[PDB]
Design a protein around this ligand. Structure first.
Ligand code: HHQ
Ligand code: HHQ
Ligand code: CL
Length: 130
């Protein structure tokens, strides 16, 4: 229905705003664009599902997210990709891991404060109906 289309449009507006807020944070610059393969040639070797905030915007705009749960799966992938690719004790790896945990924690905290649970439940019920 047009009411269900309106629901998913509201979802996309909400997710674009959360993603924009993460992308303008200087801590998260490293997560804003895909890893340049020249600069890091073994990335795509090790990381099977690369994810970054520009890709998330692209996926919103392609109507790939029908629930906030599906969006948080891609945020969780940005974090787990960084924990897997940068596991060492050296400060460069520890800094990226801390920034990745902070991205994830920030996205979850914005959604805890600003997503209505009944709006999420509606999206989940429309998604399950297809
Ligand atoms: O080693 C890296 C680089 C980048 I850019 C993102 C995640 N891990
Ligand atoms: O880095 C990886 C992880 C997995 I699971 C399969 C292949 N490469
Ligand atoms: Cl830095």
């Amino acid at each position: 229905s047009m009411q269900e289309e309106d629901t998913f449009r509201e979802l996309r507006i909400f997710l674009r705003n959360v993603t924009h807020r993460l992308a303008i944070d200087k801590r998260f610059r490293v997560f804003t664009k895909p890893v340049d393969p020249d600069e890091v040639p073994d990335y795509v070797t090790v990381i099977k599902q690369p994810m970054d905030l520009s890709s998330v915007i692209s996926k919103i705009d392609l109507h790939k997210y029908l629930t906030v749960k599906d969006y948080l799966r891609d945020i969780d992938l940005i974090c787990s990709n960084a924990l897997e690719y940068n596991p060492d004790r050296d400060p460069g790896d520890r800094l990226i891991r801390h920034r990745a945990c902070a991205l994830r924690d920030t996205a979850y905290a914005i959604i805890k404060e600003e997503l209505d649970e009944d709006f999420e439940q509606l999206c989940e019920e429309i998604q399950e109906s297809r």
